[PDB]
Specification:
- The structure is cut from a larger assembly and holds 4 copies of chain A.
- The first copy, chain A, has 491 residues and is an alpha/beta fold.
- Chain A folds into 2 domains: 1-236, P-loop containing nucleotide triphosphate hydrolases (Rossmann fold), CATH 3.40.50.300; 237-484, P-loop containing nucleotide triphosphate hydrolases (Rossmann fold, 3-Layer(aba) Sandwich).
- Chain A is built from 14 helices and 23 strands.
- In chain A, the strands form 6 sheets. The first copy, chain A, has an 8-stranded mixed β-sheet with strand order 3-2-4-5-1-6-7-8, sandwiched between helices. Chain A has a 7-stranded mixed β-sheet with strand order 13-12-14-15-11-16-19, sandwiched between helices. The first copy, chain A, has a two-stranded antiparallel ribbon with strand order 9-10.
- Chain A binds chain C through residues 178, 185-186, 191, 210-211, and chain C through 35-36.
- Strand 2 (54-59) of chain B pairs parallel with strand 1 of chain C, so a sheet runs across the interface.
- The structure holds adenosine-5'-triphosphate (5 copies) and magnesium ion (8 copies).
- One magnesium ion binds at residues 39-40, 132-133, 168 of chain A.
- The PDB classes it as circadian clock protein, transferase.
- The entry lists the keywords kaic, circadian clock protein, kinase, hexamer, ATP-binding, Biological rhythms, DNA-binding, Magnesium, Metal-binding, Nucleotide-binding, Phosphoprotein, Repressor, Serine/threonine-protein kinase, Transcription.
Chain lengths: 491, 74, 62, 506
């Protein structure tokens, strides 16, 4: 085998993308982390995918949790372990001590065990072996140097055996040492770390490959999600810039608007409707989702500010009936505070749902309500995650951003998303004659021509009604106009 | 190698010998050492630094979830 | 000899530029880092380039 | 000299200033720092100089490094220690451990070393001593208690002996405890701390005198660099304010300007060129180096923005042949990135280049260039640096500063240097009827009268053309002025109809 390293895909949504193939075959991989990070899971799900997808029996070796439990719990993600032990496809090599015992059994067992292991490997024709909490073994009475020899005995042995491994390790500080003894670190051929960061009293799981000896991989941390279908990792960086682009158009929900956009919104594209509070962003959304119910199509609306009931209300008041929109299963409303989770868990829910309603249009009721309380670098990511998804998926995306300051705002956006958006719809207030009148403007469209003037507009029970530009005013943008009343040419 | 049951001093002396004998042969040598914190001690045992004529550090500085790799000549 | 110190080339793009010539002849250079930072590679690339470019035999201790 | 302690000069660029004269005779200075900080060099240089300048022999006790190498390396700076060890001016005392050693030896040998050293000193009649890396010795199996009593013995006996010793020590962290066992700091008379602070991936070494029992010294950190000549320090605070002032005046390279400046710039003065990007500072600088050459006087240009090539390109297109300036041996362009080393370094190169060329004029295009990344305090300190040298050396200086916000900048400093400067030159944009015109201005001159006008200017292959002022404009400085007319048509040259000729004939 004089070839480049060989990797054996994991089938853990995303791991194979970050590891450019996955755990090098026949070698040991170390997945360490502070309690509650995934570990136990990761290895389980490691074996599983290996069996139910390539018929590569697995050897699981616990050092504390009783086999009966590894099963019990596994039922969490909808998979009966008891079945593969019955079909002899996975062997849970119980290695946890019993209630009673003795001591002074140091390297004593570390040896006998390498026999019971080689045992089941040969016996069950194993290929994927996972040992969870190897650490919970030396936590008997050892020091660094003692550990580095008991571990190295094993791996060295397993490599010989020809089995590809995954060792579990526990850490105390999320960013301190890689493993309880800073010894495993250099004893593994590839190291993986499960980080579960606090910050904001909210948590964010993150997986990383520190190293993979003999191959390239993806440097850095990646957010992952523990759900019902196991671990899931979105390689938001990995995602490529090869989205499909069409010159086909789609209505805005507002005719006169469509006209301004010179034909409408391209199907494959992202639209952003910015404007002070009140301007009516949520309006435009509402109307943009009905137009996808007239052409009998499925679209979704994610609201993080208003409720289910109130939305319906403020919707029946504008004419459009969502009640029906729901019955005719062509429209789906979500609703959830931004505080009920984190961008990682959100980016997913959006994705997930999107797969179970096969939308054609989609709008999020306020991104800025989603950036509420989270670092920019974190939000700017979340968007690139939903923005790209919808993109390489042919779904037209219109999002909502409520600028922090009404009138005079010097930026369609605060978090710095305009660069990410294709078409920009800017609603602003305009103080004329002591009154707060509106205005709508297609700030920019990347393909079309769109209307260059700032057209005023009012809101009635019939919905928006775009009007005429303030041709005779100045400083419109600022918000506080000034009439020219130019005395003609004065005759 | 020192990861068997040794302490700073013992380790300090040992590098001295090793390195030293190697000096005698006339062999230009490059030694690899493992750390713990990207900026913490230069070498695991807080000794290897002063004992070597030349010191090179490879940092895989994290930051913003992105890792940056640097190399320095103390 | 009776002059400054003599260096060897490592032919590692950049390094030999940083080190003002490369590692010093007849001495041990300590390259230390955390898990997955370069070391071994740097050690290997060191020997390799030695052979493949001046025909300088190399011994690697693992 | 008023101090109560007789000091001895190290002859190390800047130390004897910082240490108010040098190391106290008959005592011991603990020079310690992290790794790659300068320690041994400092000791080596210490012995050296006492030998090359006072004919004071000296003993050098090496603990880890080999007696061969200490000579091998010293050559780097151009020191033939072998020749000194030969002339018996420098005895090296090898106490390094063995590649085939046993284990156990750091106490009775300490009783032995004292006796050993007492022999060298007595035999070589030495007046200076340098024990390098005492630390390594205890580094066999010891704790703070055996370190305070064991050093002490050495020091003390050494003191009786009458030798002015220097001891080196290692220490893990750069700002934490001075030395390893955190004990060497109190047994010593003096403590010198060498650091190699990181910060922004670059590296800044500094030297500091925590304490000199009995005298006074300069407090806090002072930046030093290691060159082919050894350690070099900048007492950027021992830089007294006593430079010469002369009402002498010199050319700017622009004659209408010289007017604007009461009759040309002052010789002893600091000139500050500030303006938004693209206004023309760079230019004025050129015409400044040029003129200093058209008068047969030397001057150096340190560009941190443009290349030596491109600097010549735009210079020629503006007239002035820099190609010749170089050959005639009147002008010298340096050119370098600020990211090619921290301030401490830059500040020296500049000095370097000013002693190997002795210019009478010097230009630094874009101080605000050097301010990249660096913390104000560090920049402001460097600015006082260059500025301060050029001020005590009759070396007129033209610094260029580019303001980070064109039109609408409320301070032509950004870094707040407008107090170090003696005279400021102001360039900026003026939106006049949909056009981006420039205008200059002489904001301040300490001793002159200068022109208070905000004259507009235009650039040609020929240079900075100084025209007239926007008398008929309000909110000038604002970038986009307002037109308010009381006249304009007013005389100056009314007479209508056919006033001009054309190209045929006049
Ligand atoms: N059905 C589920 N839905 C959502 N999250 C789950 C589900 N099942 C488990 N989890 C999450 O995954 C974690 C389980 O961790 P697991 O037992 O796999 O190993 P670990 O956290 O790596 O190590 P340790 O044994 O110390 O807990 C729980 O802490 C929990 O947050
Ligand atoms: N029936 C109606 N008739 C006339 N105007 C209405 C009616 N309903 C709402 N409006 C107008 O629309 C605004 C309601 O805001 P809308 O639901 O469009 O979302 P928004 O302004 O984008 O965001 P947010 O509600 O979070 O501030 C009111 O401020 C009001 O001026
Ligand atoms: N062909 C390759 N291309 C790009 N990067 C690689 C390649 N092979 C390995 N790597 C990278 O190098 C790392 C492997 O570390 P390496 O074997 O070079 O020694 P080390 O990090 O100095 O010490 P250790 O034995 O602890 O890993 C991996 O983490 C990976 O990112
Ligand atoms: N000619 C030179 N020009 C510039 N730098 C030099 C020159 N010679 C040596 N150096 C630098 O000087 C330093 C040498 O440090 P030195 O051997 O004097 O003692 P140390 O760093 O204090 O202690 P240690 O024995 O633990 O290394 C190196 O960091 C090296 O980069
Ligand atoms: N040959 C030329 N003819 C006419 N005008 C020129 C010529 N060369 C340059 N200019 C003008 O001079 C300006 C160049 O500025 P200059 O090189 O003097 O330095 P600066 O504005 O101080 O700093 P920087 O150029 O680095 O921003 C241009 O913006 C342009 O209007
Ligand atoms: Mg576990
Ligand atoms: Mg390693
Ligand atoms: Mg709002
Ligand atoms: Mg809203
Ligand atoms: Mg290694
Ligand atoms: Mg050192
Ligand atoms: Mg030294
Ligand atoms: Mg310039």
């Amino acid at each position: 085998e004089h070839q480049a390293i060989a990797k054996m895909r994991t089938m853990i949504e995303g791991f194979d993308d970050i590891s450019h193939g996955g755990l090098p075959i026949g070698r040991s991989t170390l997945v360490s982390g502070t309690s509650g990070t995934g570990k136990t899971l990761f290895s389980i799900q490691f074996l599983y995918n290996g069996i139910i997808e390539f018929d590569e029996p697995g050897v699981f070796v616990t050092f504390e949790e009783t086999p009966q439990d590894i099963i019990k719990n596994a039922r969490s993600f909808g998979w009966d372990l008891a079945k593969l032990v019955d079909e002899g496809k996975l062997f849970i090599l119980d290695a946890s001590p019993d209630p009673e015992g003795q001591e002074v059994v140091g390297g004593f067992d570390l040896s006998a065990l390498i026999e019971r292991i080689n045992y089941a490997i040969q016996k069950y024709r194993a290929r994927r072996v996972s040992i969870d909490s190897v650490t919970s073994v030396f936590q008997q009475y050892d020091a660094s140097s003692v550990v580095r020899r008991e571990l190295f005995r094993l791996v060295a042995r397993l490599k010989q055996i020809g089995a590809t491994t995954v060792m579990t390790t526990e850490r105390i500080e999320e960013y301190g040492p890689i493993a309880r003894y800073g010894v495993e670190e250099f004893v593994s051929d590839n190291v993986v770390i499960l980080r579960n960061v606090l910050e904001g009293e909210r948590r964010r799981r993150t997986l990383e490959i520190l190293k993979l000896r003999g191959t390239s991989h993806m440097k850095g941390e990646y957010p992952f999600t523990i759900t019902d279908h196991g671990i899931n990792i979105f390689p938001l960086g990995a995602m490529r810039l090869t989205q499909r682009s069409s010159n086909v158009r789609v209505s805005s929900g507002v005719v006169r608007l469509d006209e301004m956009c010179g034909g409408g919104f391209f199907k494959d594209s992202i639209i952003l409707a910015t404007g002070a509070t009140g301007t009516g962003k949520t309006l435009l959304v509402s109307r943009f989702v009905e137009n996808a119910c007239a052409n009998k199509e499925r679209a979704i609306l994610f609201a993080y500010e208003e409720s289910r009931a109130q939305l319906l209300r403020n919707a029946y008041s504008w004419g459009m009936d969502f009640e029906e929109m729901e019955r005719q299963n062509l429209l789906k409303i979500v609703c959830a505070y931004p505080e009920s989770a984190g961008l990682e868990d959100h980016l997913q829910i959006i994705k997930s749902e999107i797969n179970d309603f096969k939308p054609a249009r989609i709008a999020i009721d306020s991104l800025s309500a989603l950036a509420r309380g989270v670092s920019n670098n974190a939000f700017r990511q979340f968007v690139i995650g939903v923005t790209g998804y919808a993109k390489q998926e042919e779904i037209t995306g219109l999002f909502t951003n409520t600028s922090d300051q009404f009138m005079g705002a010097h930026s369609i956006t605060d978090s710095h998303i305009a660069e990410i958006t294709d078409t920009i719809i800017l609603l602003q207030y305009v103080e004329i004659r002591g009154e707060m009148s509106r205005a709508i403007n297609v700030f920019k469209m990347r393909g079309s021509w769109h209307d260059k003037a700032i057209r005023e507009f009012m809101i009635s029970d019939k919905g928006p009604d775009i009007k005429d530009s303030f041709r005779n005013f100045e400083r419109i943008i600022s918000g506080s106009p000034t009439r020219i009343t130019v005395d003609e040419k004065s005759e």
